[PDB]
Amino acid sequence: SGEADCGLRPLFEKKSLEDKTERELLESYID
Amino acid sequence: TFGSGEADCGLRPLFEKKSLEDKTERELLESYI
Amino acid sequence: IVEGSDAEIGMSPWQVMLFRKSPQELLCGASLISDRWVLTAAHCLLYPPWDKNFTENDLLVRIGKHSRTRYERNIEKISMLEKIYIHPRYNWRENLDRDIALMKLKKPVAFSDYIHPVCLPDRETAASLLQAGYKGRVTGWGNLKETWTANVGKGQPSVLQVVNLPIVERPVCKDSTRIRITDNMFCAGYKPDEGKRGDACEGDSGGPFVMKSPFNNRWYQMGIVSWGKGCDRDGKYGFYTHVFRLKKWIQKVIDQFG
Amino acid sequence: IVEGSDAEIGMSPWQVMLFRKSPQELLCGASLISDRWVLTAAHCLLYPPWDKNFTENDLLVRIGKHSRTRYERNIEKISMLEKIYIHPRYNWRENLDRDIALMKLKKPVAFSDYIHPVCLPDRETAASLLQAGYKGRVTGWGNLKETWTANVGKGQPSVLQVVNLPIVERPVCKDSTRIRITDNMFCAGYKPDEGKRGDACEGDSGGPFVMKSPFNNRWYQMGIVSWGKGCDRDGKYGFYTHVFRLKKWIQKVIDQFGE
Numbered sequence: 333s334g335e336a337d338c339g340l341r342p343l344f345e346k347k348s349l350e351d352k353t354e355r356e357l358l359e360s361y362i363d
Numbered sequence: 364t365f366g367s368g369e370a371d372c373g374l375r376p377l378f379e380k381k382s383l384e385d386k387t388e389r390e391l392l393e394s395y396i
Numbered sequence: 397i398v399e400g401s402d403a404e405i406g407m408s409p410w411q412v413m414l415f416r417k418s419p420q421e422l423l424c425g426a427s428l429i430s431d432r433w434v435l436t437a438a439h440c441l442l443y444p445p446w447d448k449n450f451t452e453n454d455l456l457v458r459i460g461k462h463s464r465t466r467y468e469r470n471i472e473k474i475s476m477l478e479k480i481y482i483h484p485r486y487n488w489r490e491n492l493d494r495d496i497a498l499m500k501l502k503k504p505v506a507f508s509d510y511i512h513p514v515c516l517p518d519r520e521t522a523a524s525l526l527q528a529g530y531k532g533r534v535t536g537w538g539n540l541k542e543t544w545t546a547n548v549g550k551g552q553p554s555v556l557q558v559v560n561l562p563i564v565e566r567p568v569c570k571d572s573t574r575i576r577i578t579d580n581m582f583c584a585g586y587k588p589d590e591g592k593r594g595d596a597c598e599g600d601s602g603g604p605f606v607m608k609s610p611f612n613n614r615w616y617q618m619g620i621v622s623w624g625k626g627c628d629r630d631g632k633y634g635f636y637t638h639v640f641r642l643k644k645w646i647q648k649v650i651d652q653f654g
Numbered sequence: 655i656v657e658g659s660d661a662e663i664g665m666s667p668w669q670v671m672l673f674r675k676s677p678q679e680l681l682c683g684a685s686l687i688s689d690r691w692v693l694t695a696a697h698c699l700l701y702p703p704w705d706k707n708f709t710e711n712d713l714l715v716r717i718g719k720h721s722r723t724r725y726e727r728n729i730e731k732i733s734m735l736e737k738i739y740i741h742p743r744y745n746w747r748e749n750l751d752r753d754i755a756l757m758k759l760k761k762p763v764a765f766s767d768y769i770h771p772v773c774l775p776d777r778e779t780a781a782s783l784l785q786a787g788y789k790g791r792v793t794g795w796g797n798l799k800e801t802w803t804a805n806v807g808k809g810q811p812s813v814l815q816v817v818n819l820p821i822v823e824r825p826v827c828k829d830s831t832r833i834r835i836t837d838n839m840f841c842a843g844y845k846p847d848e849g850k851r852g853d854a855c856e857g858d859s860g861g862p863f864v865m866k867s868p869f870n871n872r873w874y875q876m877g878i879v880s881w882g883k884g885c886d887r888d889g890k891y892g893f894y895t896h897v898f899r900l901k902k903w904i905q906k907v908i909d910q911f912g913e
C-alpha cells in the first residue's frame with residue numbers, strides 16, 4: 333500500500349511548501 | 364628532404380616502388396568523390 | 397551527481413540506498429514505490445562485466461537517509477531483501493535495454509517525513525510529461541566529479557545530491573552514442589551549449605528520475621538512472637530506463653508476489 | 655585496432671613503436687616523417703590524468719616491426735631519443751587540442767624495404783583529401799577488443815593491425831561527444847548502422863592516419879590518433895590531431911632543432 337498517497341512529500345506538498353528547485357521543473361513545461 | 368628523404372616520402376619500397384598495390388588501398392581510392 | 401546540490405531534508409523521501417552486506421559498501425541507488433517494494437536498475441544487481449551478481453542476502457537497503465556518513469537515528473531505516481526480480485528481457489550484453497529490477501523488502505517500512513513512496517506513471521502522465529525539453533530530477537550519492545582517472549576515494553558526497561536534467565530528443569541522443577537506444581529507454585542531460593551543467597554518474601545507477609506533474613502535484617518516477625556519464629571521460633547524455641514503458645512488467649511482478 | 659586486419663610486410667614502413675624505457679612497456683604508436691624525426695601524440699608523453707610525464711631519457715623507440723612477438727632479424731631497428739617536443743599550446747586538461755609531439759632520434763635511422771618516411775600534407779593535399787566520406791588508414795598495436803572491463807592481458811595483437819576509416823563531418827562528430835572539438839582535429843569512424851565495422855583504440859594513440867594521394871600516389875599523414883574509442887564502453891567516433899593544421903609548428907621545430 334501507499335499508492336493512494338504516493339508522490340506527495342510530507343515536508344513539502346503536505347505542508348504546502350516547495351523545494352528550492354521544483355519551480356525550475358514546472359517552468360520547463362512552458363518551453 | 365629534411366633529414367628524412369622527403370623527395371621519396373610516401374612511396375613504400377615494397378608497393379609503390381615495385382608497382383604493387385596493397386590489399387585494401389583500393390577501398391581508399393574508391394572513397395574519393 | 398556532478399554539478400548538483402545538497403538535497404533538502406525529505407526532498408526525496410522515496411530515495412533508497414542499495415548496499416552490499418560485507419564488506420559494507422554502497423552499491424547503487426533505488427526508489428521506494430510502496431511499503432514493501434523498491435525499484436532499481438538491473439545492472440546494479442547483475443552485470444558480469446563488472447563481476448556483479450548479487451542475491452537477496454548479499455544486499456541490504458537504507459531508506460530515509462540524508463547524510464552518507466552520520467547515522468540518522470530514528471530517521472533512517474535498514475531493511476533486508478526478501479526477493480530480487482530482474483526483468484527477464486534485460487540485455488546487458490549490448491545496451492542495458494530493460495535495465496530494471498524490483499526488490500521486495502522482508503518487512504514493510506514505515507512511512508514518515510523522511511520516507512514516502514513515489515508514484516509510477518500512467519499512460520496520460522507518461523505521454524504528457526515524458527517530452528523533450530521538459531525537465532526531470534535525478535538524485536543520488538555517486539561521485540561529485542570525474543572518476544575515469546585513478547582513485548575512488550575522492551569525490552564522495554556527504555549528503556544526498558540532487559540535479560534537474562532536461563529530457564533529450566530521441567534522435568539527438570541516438571547520434572550521441574554507438575549504443576542501440578531502444579524505446580524502453582530515454583536520454584536526459586544538457587547540451588554543452590546551455591550554461592546550466594549537472595549530470596548523473598555511474599554511482600547514481602538505479603536511482604530515480606522523477607518529474608512533478610503540474611496536473612495533480614504528485615512526483616512521478618519516469619525513469620531509472622541506467623547510465624549516467626557525468627563522471628566519465630566523455631559521454632554527451634545520460635541513459636534512463638523508461639519506467640512507464642515497463643510498467644506492465646512492474647505490475648505483473650507486484651500483482652503476484654505481494 | 656578493433657575489427658581491423660593484419661598489416662602486410664612493408665605496408666606501413668613509417669610505423670614506429672614508442673616504449674617506456676623501464677619498466678619496458680609499449681606505450682603508443684608513432685610515425686617516421688624523416689630519418690631523425692618521429693611524430694606521435696602529445697598525451698602519449700604527457701598526460702597527468704594517467705600518471706604520464708616522460709622525457710627523452712624515459713623512452714625508447716622501435717622501427718620497422720611487423721610482429722610484436724618475434725625479434726625481426728636484420729629488419730627492425732631500436733633507437734633512443736635525443737629530445738622530445740610537445741606542442742606549446744597542447745591542451746590536456748580539456749580536449750586534447752593540439753595533441754601532437756615530435757621526437758628526435760639520437761641518430762638517423764636507415765631506410766629500407768621496411769623503414770620509410772611518410773609525407774606531410776601541404777595546403778592542397780589537405781583540402782583535397784580531408785573531406786567527409788573519404789577514407790584514411792589507421793595502424794597500430796592497440797587492443798583487438800573491449801578494454802573497459804577487467805584485465806589488460808587478453809586482446810593484444812601479435813602483428814601490426816590496419817584499418818580504413820571514413821572521415822566524419824564535423825557537425826556529426828560534435829553530435830557524438832561533449833568534448834570541445836577544435837579545428838586542429840577531425841573525426842573518423844563508421845556509423846553504427848554499419849555494413850563496415852572497425853575503429854582505433856586507446857592503444858593506437860600516436861599512430862598515423864594516412865591517405866594515399868590519387869594524384870602522385872604518395873601516402874600522406876593527415877592525422878594522429880588522439881582518442882580512439884573502439885575499445886571503450888561507448889564512443890561513436892575517434893579524434894585525430896589534424897596534422898596539416900599544425901604543420902607550421904612541426905616545420906618550426908624541425909627547422910630549429912634539426913640540421
Ligand SMILES: *[C@H]1O[C@H](CO[C@@H]2O[C@@H](C)[C@@H](O)[C@@H](O)[C@@H]2O)[C@@H](O[C@H]2O[C@H](CO)[C@@H](O[C@@H]3O[C@H](CO[C@H]4O[C@H](CO)[C@@H](O)[C@H](O)[C@@H]4O)[C@@H](O)[C@H](O)[C@@H]3O)[C@H](O)[C@H]2NC(C)=O)[C@H](O)[C@H]1NC(C)=O
Nearest residue numbers: 699700701702703704705706707708709710712740746747
Ligand atoms: C611532469 O614533468 C616534470 C617532472 O620533473 C620531476 O621529475 C619527475 C619524475 C617527478 O618527480 C616530478 O615531481 C619532478 O618535478 C615536472 O617538472 C616541472 O614542475 C616542477 C613542479 O612545479 C618544477 O619544480 C619547481 O622548480 C622550481 C625551480 O627549481 C628547479 O630549477 C630547475 C628547473 O628549472 C631544476 O633543474 C632544479 O632541480 C630545481 O628543482 C622551484 O622554484 C619550484 O618550487 C618547483 O620545485 C620543475 O622545475 C619543472 N620541470 C621543468 C624543469 O620544467 C612537470 O611539471 C610535470 N608536468 C606535469 C605533470 O604537469
Ligand SMILES: *[C@@H]1O[C@H](CO[C@@H]2O[C@@H](C)[C@@H](O)[C@@H](O)[C@@H]2O)[C@@H](O[C@H]2O[C@H](CO)[C@@H](O)[C@H](O)[C@H]2NC(C)=O)[C@H](O)[C@H]1NC(C)=O
Nearest residue numbers: 441442443444445446447448449450451452453454482488
Ligand atoms: C549469477 O550467479 C548464479 C549463481 O552462482 C552460483 O552461486 C554463487 C554464490 C557462486 O558460488 C557461483 O560460483 C555459483 O555458480 C549463476 O548460476 C549458476 O550457478 C548455479 C548454482 O550452482 C547453477 O545452478 C546454474 O546452472 C548456473 N547458471 C548457469 C546456467 O550458468 C548465474 O548464471 C549468474 N548469472 C549470470 C547469468 O551470469
